[PDB]
Amino acid sequence: VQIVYKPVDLSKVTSKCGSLGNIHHKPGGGQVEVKSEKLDFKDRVQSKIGSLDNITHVPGGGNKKIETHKLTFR
Amino acid sequence: VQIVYKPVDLSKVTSKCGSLGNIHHKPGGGQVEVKSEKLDFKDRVQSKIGSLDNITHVPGGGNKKIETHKLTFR
Amino acid sequence: VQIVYKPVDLSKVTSKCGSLGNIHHKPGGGQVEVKSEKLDFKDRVQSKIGSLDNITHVPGGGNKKIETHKLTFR
Amino acid sequence: VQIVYKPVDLSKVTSKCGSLGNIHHKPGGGQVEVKSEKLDFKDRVQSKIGSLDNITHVPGGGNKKIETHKLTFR
Amino acid sequence: VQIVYKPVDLSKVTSKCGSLGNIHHKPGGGQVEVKSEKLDFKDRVQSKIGSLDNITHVPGGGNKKIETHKLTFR
Amino acid sequence: VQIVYKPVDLSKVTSKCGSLGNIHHKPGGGQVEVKSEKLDFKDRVQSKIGSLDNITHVPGGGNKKIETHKLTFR
Amino acid sequence: VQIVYKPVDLSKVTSKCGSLGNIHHKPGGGQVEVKSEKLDFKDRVQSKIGSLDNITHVPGGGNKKIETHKLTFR
Amino acid sequence: VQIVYKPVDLSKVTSKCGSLGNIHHKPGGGQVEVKSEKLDFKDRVQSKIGSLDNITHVPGGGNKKIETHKLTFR
Amino acid sequence: VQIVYKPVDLSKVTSKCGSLGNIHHKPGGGQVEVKSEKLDFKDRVQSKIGSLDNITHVPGGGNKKIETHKLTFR
Ligand SMILES: [Cl-]
Ligand SMILES: [Cl-]
Ligand SMILES: [Cl-]
Ligand SMILES: [Cl-]
Ligand SMILES: [Cl-]
Ligand SMILES: [Cl-]
Ligand SMILES: [Cl-]
Ligand SMILES: [Cl-]
Ligand SMILES: [Cl-]
Ligand SMILES: [Cl-]
Ligand SMILES: [Cl-]
Ligand SMILES: [Cl-]
Ligand SMILES: [Cl-]
Ligand SMILES: [Cl-]
Ligand SMILES: [Cl-]
Ligand SMILES: [Cl-]
Ligand SMILES: [Cl-]
Ligand SMILES: [Cl-]
Ligand SMILES: [K+]
Ligand SMILES: [K+]
Ligand SMILES: [K+]
Ligand SMILES: [K+]
Ligand SMILES: [K+]
Ligand SMILES: [K+]
Ligand SMILES: [K+]
Ligand SMILES: [K+]
Ligand SMILES: [K+]
Ligand SMILES: [K+]
Ligand SMILES: [K+]
Ligand SMILES: [K+]
Ligand SMILES: [K+]
Ligand SMILES: [K+]
Ligand SMILES: [K+]
Ligand SMILES: [K+]
Ligand SMILES: [K+]
Ligand SMILES: [K+]
Numbered sequence: 001v002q003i004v005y006k007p008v009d010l011s012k013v014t015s016k017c018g019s020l021g022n023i024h025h026k027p028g029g030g031q032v033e034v035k036s037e038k039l040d041f042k043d044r045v046q047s048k049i050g051s052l053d054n055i056t057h058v059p060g061g062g063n064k065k066i067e068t069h070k071l072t073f074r
Numbered sequence: 075v076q077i078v079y080k081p082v083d084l085s086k087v088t089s090k091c092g093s094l095g096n097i098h099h100k101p102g103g104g105q106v107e108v109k110s111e112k113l114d115f116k117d118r119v120q121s122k123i124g125s126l127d128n129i130t131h132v133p134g135g136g137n138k139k140i141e142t143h144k145l146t147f148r
Numbered sequence: 149v150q151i152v153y154k155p156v157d158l159s160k161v162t163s164k165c166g167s168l169g170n171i172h173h174k175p176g177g178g179q180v181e182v183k184s185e186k187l188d189f190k191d192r193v194q195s196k197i198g199s200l201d202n203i204t205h206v207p208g209g210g211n212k213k214i215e216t217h218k219l220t221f222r
Numbered sequence: 223v224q225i226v227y228k229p230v231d232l233s234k235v236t237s238k239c240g241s242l243g244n245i246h247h248k249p250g251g252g253q254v255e256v257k258s259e260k261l262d263f264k265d266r267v268q269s270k271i272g273s274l275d276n277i278t279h280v281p282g283g284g285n286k287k288i289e290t291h292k293l294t295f296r
Numbered sequence: 297v298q299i300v301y302k303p304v305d306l307s308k309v310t311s312k313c314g315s316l317g318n319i320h321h322k323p324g325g326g327q328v329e330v331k332s333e334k335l336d337f338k339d340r341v342q343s344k345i346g347s348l349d350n351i352t353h354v355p356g357g358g359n360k361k362i363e364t365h366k367l368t369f370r
Numbered sequence: 371v372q373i374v375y376k377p378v379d380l381s382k383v384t385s386k387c388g389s390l391g392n393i394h395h396k397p398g399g400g401q402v403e404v405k406s407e408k409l410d411f412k413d414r415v416q417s418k419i420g421s422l423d424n425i426t427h428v429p430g431g432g433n434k435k436i437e438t439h440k441l442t443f444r
Numbered sequence: 445v446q447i448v449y450k451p452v453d454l455s456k457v458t459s460k461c462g463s464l465g466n467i468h469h470k471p472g473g474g475q476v477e478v479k480s481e482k483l484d485f486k487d488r489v490q491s492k493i494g495s496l497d498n499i500t501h502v503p504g505g506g507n508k509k510i511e512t513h514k515l516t517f518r
Numbered sequence: 519v520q521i522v523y524k525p526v527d528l529s530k531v532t533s534k535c536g537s538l539g540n541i542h543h544k545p546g547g548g549q550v551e552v553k554s555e556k557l558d559f560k561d562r563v564q565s566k567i568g569s570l571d572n573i574t575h576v577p578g579g580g581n582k583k584i585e586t587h588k589l590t591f592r
Numbered sequence: 593v594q595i596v597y598k599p600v601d602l603s604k605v606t607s608k609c610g611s612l613g614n615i616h617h618k619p620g621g622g623q624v625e626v627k628s629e630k631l632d633f634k635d636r637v638q639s640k641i642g643s644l645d646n647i648t649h650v651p652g653g654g655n656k657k658i659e660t661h662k663l664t665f666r
Contacts, residue, residue: 002076005145007217011085015135017208022095022169023130030103030177030198031388032124038112045119048127050103055129062133062207065141071079072146076150081217083157089165089209096169097204104177105314105388106198111185118192122199124177129203136207137161140214145153147221166623179240179314179388224298227367231305235359239311243318243392251326251346251400253462259333266340272328272400273344277351278319281358281432282387283311289361291303291377294368300374301441310384317392325400325420327462327536336410343415346402348422352393355432357385363435365377368442401462401536401610446520449589453527457581461533465540465614473548473568473622481555488562494550495566496619499573500541503580503654504609505533511583513525513599516590519593523663526600533607539614547622547642556630563637568624570644574615577654579607585659589597592666 005071013063020060027052079145087137094134101126153219161211168208175200227293235285242282249274301367309359316356323348375441383433390430397422449515457507464504471496523589531581538578545570597663605655612652619644 032050106124180198254272328346402420476494550568624642 003145004076004078004080006078006080007143008080008082011083011139011141012088013137013139014086014088015091015133015137015209016089017091017094017134019093020095020132020134020208023097023132024099025128025130026098026100027126027128027200028100028102029126030105030124032103032106032198034108034110034123036108036110039110039115040113041115041119043115043118045115045121047119047121047123048125049123050125052126053128055131057130058132059136060134063135063137063209065139067139067141067143069143070146072144074148077219078151079153079219081153081155081157085157085159085161085213087161087211087213089163089211091163091165091168091208093167094169094206094208096171097206098172098174099202099204100172100174101200101202102174102176102389103200104198105179106177107181108197109183112187113184114188115193116188116190119189119195120193121195122197122201124198125200127199127201129205131203131205131207133207133209135209137209138212140212142216142218144218144220146218176315225300227301227303229303231303231307233307235307235309237311237313239313241315242313243316245319247321247323250324251328253326254328256330256332258331258335261335263335263337263339263341265338266342267337268342269344271330271343271345272326272402273346274323274325274348274397275344276321276323276349278321278353279351280316280319280354282313282316282355282390283357283359283385283433284355285309285311285359287307287309287361287363289363291363291365292368293299293301294366296370298372298374300376302374302376302378304378305381307381308384310382311386313385313387315389316387317390319393320396321394322396322398324398324463325402327401329403330405332404332406332409334408337415338412340413341411341415341417343417345404345417345419346400347418347420348397348399349418350395350397350423351425352395352427353425354390354393354428355385356387356390356429357431357433358429359383359385359433361381361383361435361437363381363437365437365439366442367373367375368440370444398537446522448522449525450522451525453525453529455529457529457531459533459535461535463537464535465538467541469543469545472546473550475549477551479553480557483557485557485559485561485563487560488564489559490564491566493552493565493567494548494622494624495568496545496547496570497566498543498545498571499575500543501573501575502538502541503575503577504535504538504612505577505579505581505607505655507531507533507581509529509531509583509585511585513586514588514590515521515523516588518592521593521595523597523599527603529603531603531605533609535607535609537611538609539612541615542618543616544618544620546620547624549623551625552627554626554628554631558632559637560634562635563633563639565637565639567626567639567641568622569640569642570619570621571640572617572619572645573647574617574649575647576612576615576650578609578612578652579655580651581605581607581655583603583605583657583659585603585657587599587659587661588664589595590662590664 013065087139383435605657
């Protein structure tokens with residue numbers, strides 16, 4: 001047999017942005033009171049009380065190309 | 075047999091933006107009171123009490139191409 | 149046999165935007181009181197009490213192309 | 223004689239309020255013209271002409287208990 | 297004689313408030329003209345002309361107990 | 371004689387407030403014209419013309435207990 | 445001959461104003477589409493297409509006196 | 519001959535203003551599309567397409583006197 | 593002959609202003625598209641496309657007196 005795997009990719013993933021910015025975070029915490037007695041946990045606990053967790057992600061591009069190729073015999 | 079896998083991709087994924095910005099987050103926490111007694115958890119707990127969790131994602135592009143190619147024999 | 153897989157993709161996915169922005173988030177928490185006694189949980193718990201969870205996603209483009217190609221023999 | 227003054231006070235005077243606020247005072251003065259000639263005052267004068275006197279009293283509670291106890295011999 | 301003054305006070309005067317605020321005063325003065333000629337005052341004068349006198353009293357509680365106790369012989 | 375003055379006070383005067391604030395004063399003066407001729411005052415004068423007198427009192431509690439006790443013989 | 449040009453001008457042109465203001469211009473453009481083909485103009489053209497042309501003239505006085513005096517011999 | 523040109527001007531052009539201001543211009547453009555083909559102009563063109571031309575003239579007085587005097591022989 | 597040109601000017605052009613100000617310009621551009629082909633101009637062109645031309649003139653007085661005097665023989 002003759003098997004030819006010859007895909008052609010000339011594709012563009014592209015951005016232009018002029019000005020990127022002017023982002024202001026001023027979150028304000030509240031008043032939090034937690035009273036706990038006789039609590040049983042048998043498994044994992046993720047707990048957050050009054051926290052101000054922030055992610056700022058501001059890439060000038062942030063473009064992505066995911067591409068996958070296989071030729072496969074089982 | 076003769077088997078030919080020859081797909082052609084000339085595709086564009088493209089953006090232009092002039093000005094990207096002027097984003098203001100000013101969330102204010104409230105008043106939170108939690109009283110807990112004799113609670114049993116047999117399995118995983120995710121808990122958040124009065125927290126101000128933020129994600130800001132501002133890519134100048136943020137374009138994506140996902141593409142997948144297979145030739146396969148079982 | 150002769151089998152030929154020759155699709156051609158000339159496709160455009162495109163945006164133009166002049167100004168993107170002027171976004172203001174000012175949520176205010178209320179008054180929350182929770183009293184809990186003698187609760188049993190046999191399975192996973194997700195709880196949020198008075199939290200101000202925010203996601204701000206503002207891509208200048210945010211366009212996507214998903215494509216899949218297979219030639220397959222079983 | 224035996225005289226016993228033994229009153230018992232277990233009284234509650236109580237408030238709960240969630241949010242107290244959003245008060246806007248925007249009074250605008252008019253046009254006032256006063257012309258006075260040959261006036262005699264023999265006694266105290268309180269005069270106000272075109273004034274914008276304000277009291278804003280906004281207690282979160284503002285509850286009161288007044289109590290009086292006497293045992294008295296003349 | 298035996299005279300016993302033994303009053304018992306276990307009284308509560310109490311408040312809870314969540315959020316207290318958002319008070320705006322924007323009073324605007326008018327046009328005031330006063331012309332006075334040959335006025336005689338024999339006694340005290342309080343005068344206010346076009347003034348914007350303000351009191352803002354915003355106690356988070358502002359609760360009060362006034363109590364008076366006497367045992368008296370004349 | 372036997373005279374016993376033994377009053378018992380276990381009384382509470384109490385407040386809780388979460389957030390206290392966000393108070394804005396922007397009073398604006400008007401136009402005031404005062405013309406005075408041949409005025410006689412024989413006694414005290416309090417005068418205010420076009421003034422913007424302000425008191426801001428914002429105690430987090432502002433609770434008060436006034437209590438008075440006497441045992442008296444004349 | 446004796447010729448005398450002796451006019452006397454004692455004239456007042458006067459204004460009093462207390463507060464002049466509180467002017468808000470918020471015009472919004474609509475949608476305008478103009479398609480033009482094979483037009484000949486032999487003479488001057490003044491054209492405006494979707495413009496938001498504004499004059500704000502707010503003199504505190506803005507009073508005027510125009511006067512003319514001539515004595516003339518031909 | 520005797521010719522006397524002796525006009526007397528004692529005239530007042532006068533203003534009083536207390537407060538002059540509080541002027542807000544917030545005009546917004548719309549959507550303008552102009553398509554032009556084969557247009558001939560033999561003479562001057564003034565054109566404005568989607569412009570937000572503004573004049574703000576706010577003189578505290580802005581009063582004027584124009585006066586003209588001639589004695590003339592031809 | 594005797595010719596006398598003796599005009600008398602004791603005239604006032606006058607202003608008083610207390611407060612002059614609080615002027616805000618926030619004009620916003622819209623969306624302008626212009627497409628032109630085969631246009632002929634034989635004379636001057638003044639063109640403005642999508643511009644935000646501003647004049648702010650705020651003189652504290654801005655009063656003017658124009659006065660002209662002639663004695664003339666031809
Ligand atoms: Cl909170
Ligand atoms: Cl916990
Ligand atoms: Cl908090
Ligand atoms: Cl809350
Ligand atoms: Cl919990
Ligand atoms: Cl829970
Ligand atoms: Cl009076
Ligand atoms: Cl008034
Ligand atoms: Cl006033
Ligand atoms: Cl008076
Ligand atoms: Cl004033
Ligand atoms: Cl006075
Ligand atoms: Cl035209
Ligand atoms: Cl328009
Ligand atoms: Cl426009
Ligand atoms: Cl044109
Ligand atoms: Cl042009
Ligand atoms: Cl524009
Ligand atoms: K909080
Ligand atoms: K907990
Ligand atoms: K905990
Ligand atoms: K909250
Ligand atoms: K809980
Ligand atoms: K809440
Ligand atoms: K007033
Ligand atoms: K008076
Ligand atoms: K005033
Ligand atoms: K007075
Ligand atoms: K005075
Ligand atoms: K004033
Ligand atoms: K427009
Ligand atoms: K045109
Ligand atoms: K425009
Ligand atoms: K044009
Ligand atoms: K042009
Ligand atoms: K523009």
